[PDB]
Design a protein around this ligand. Structure first.
Ligand SMILES: Cc1cnc(Nc2ccc(OCCN3CCCC3)cc2)nc1Nc1cccc(S(=O)(=O)NC(C)(C)C)c1
Length: 127
């Protein structure tokens, strides 16, 4: 195959904002998920060439990963928390679409998602 370029993480033409919810998403949510024992397959874009998955980007047209999310948060790429939450959800969904239920990678994603939802429930209120 060829891998696609990774998702954009910095846009000089996109307005930037720093809020307590976005700060929480970086300093608590991203941080906590990153350190999970099953996080590492989700820490960078899927290298479908290295993994020998010629159909990966035929099926997954909206790829997302936590390396990308980390950079977007760092670069104040998001205007609001929902845009970031959507990226996490896209990452999980992508795993559940490409892989069979019960597969080891799916069980890993499910562990991360449970933790994610726990942290999102404790999202601070704005301002
Ligand atoms: C985010 C993500 C979503 N889906 C997948 N699916 C997937 C990945 C690789 C696959 O290859 C199957 C056969 N090989 C697996 C290792 C020996 C040969 C089959 C399916 N992988 C993902 N990431 C991933 C990243 C790095 C390594 C691997 S892995 O192939 O080592 N799979 C685990 C053992 C981590 C479950 C997987």
């Amino acid at each position: 195959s060829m891998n696609p370029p990774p998702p954009e993480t910095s846009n000089p033409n996109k307005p930037k904002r720093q809020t307590n919810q976005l700060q929480y998403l970086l300093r608590v949510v991203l941080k906590t998920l990153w350190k999970h024992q099953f996080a590492w397959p989700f820490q960078q874009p899927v290298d479908a060439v290295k993994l020998n998955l010629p159909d990966y980007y035929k099926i997954i047209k909206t790829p997302m990963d936590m390396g990308t999310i980390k950079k977007r948060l760092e670069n104040n790429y998001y205007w609001n928390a929902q845009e970031c939450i959507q990226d996490f959800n896209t990452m999980f969904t992508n795993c559940y679409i490409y892989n069979k239920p019960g597969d080891d990678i799916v069980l890993m994603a499910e562990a991360l998602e449970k933790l994610f939802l726990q942290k999102i429930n404790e999202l601070p209120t704005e301002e």
